[PDB]
């Protein structure tokens, strides 16, 4: 592909006939599905030079649920598979990383009770564990900036509010290959925590 477009990250060769209207159809899609404009509430929970992460609570509004789920289902298709979705949908928490007005990254924790040290195979032996990371993503063009790291960052202050979390308290569930390479070096251990390994 010749082309990136800057907006939706598509690859796309602005030279086909095909490819430039397939890329306005998934163009369209794709803005829809990230767009970030007109919450009547937002819970900002960090403020950055760049950004800003909004928290979505459990029992929140209608719009704000959806957005999430509209999120999700890009990473859906962008994975190419069904990661193992949250076992209590109605105990999860959202953090949106919004960059001019779209979600540029999303991680939905959920509370664990055990997770399990990865050598891929993991450990059979349980740790106690308190905050499990069920998704995280960045948006394509906007990654190796720190968009992540600052997501988990404030799952780590805001999951437990009053605490702050541990590495050694927070697991990732069934990492992908990027996942992995993130979270080894967010933990500053390739033996990190995983769970739904
Ligand atoms: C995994 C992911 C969320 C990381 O997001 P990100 O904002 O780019 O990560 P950060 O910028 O906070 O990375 C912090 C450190 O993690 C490491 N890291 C992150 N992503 C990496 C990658 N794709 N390859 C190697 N190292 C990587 C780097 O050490 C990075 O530090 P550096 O940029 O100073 O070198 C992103 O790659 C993503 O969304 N991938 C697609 C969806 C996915 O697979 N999610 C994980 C499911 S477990
Ligand atoms: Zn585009």
Same mark, same amino acid.
């Given at each position: 592909?010749?082309?990136? *477009?800057?907006?939706? @990250? ?26 970030? +404009? ?11 030079? !760049? @950004? ?15 957005? +999430?789920?509209? +999120?999700? =289902?890009? +990473?859906?298709? =962008? ?10 949908? !109605?105990?999860?928490? %959202?953090?949106? $990383?919004?960059? =001019? ?7 939905? &924790? ?11 195979? *993991? ?24 968009? &992540? ?9 805001? $999951? ?6 541990? %590495?050694? =308290?927070? &697991? ?5 290959? !990027?996942?992995?390479?993130?979270? %080894?070096?967010? *933990? ?10």
């Amino acid at each position: 592909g010749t082309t990136v *477009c800057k907006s939706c @990250g598509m690859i796309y060769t602005a030279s086909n006939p095909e490819d430039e209207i397939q890329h306005l159809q998934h163009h369209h899609r794709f803005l829809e599905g990230i767009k970030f +404009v007109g919450w009547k509430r937002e819970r900002v929970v960090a403020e950055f030079w !760049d @950004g800003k992460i909004v928290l979505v609570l459990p029992r929140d509004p209608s719009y704000a649920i959806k957005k +999430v789920e509209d +999120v999700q =289902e890009l +990473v859906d298709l =962008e994975l190419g598979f069904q990661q193992t979705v949250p076992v209590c949908p !109605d105990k999860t928490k %959202t953090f949106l $990383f919004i960059d =001019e007005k779209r979600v540029v990254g999303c991680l939905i &924790a959920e509370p664990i009770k055990q997770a399990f040290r990865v050598l891929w195979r *993991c450990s059979d032996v349980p740790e106690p564990a308190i905050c499990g990371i069920s998704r995280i993503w960045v948006f394509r063009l906007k990654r190796r900036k720190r968009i &992540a790291r600052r997501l988990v960052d404030t799952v780590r202050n805001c $999951f437990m509010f009053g605490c702050f979390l541990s %590495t050694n =308290e927070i &697991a990732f569930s069934d990492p992908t290959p !990027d996942g992995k390479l993130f979270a %080894t070096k967010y *933990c500053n251990t390739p033996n990190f925590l995983v769970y739904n390994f």
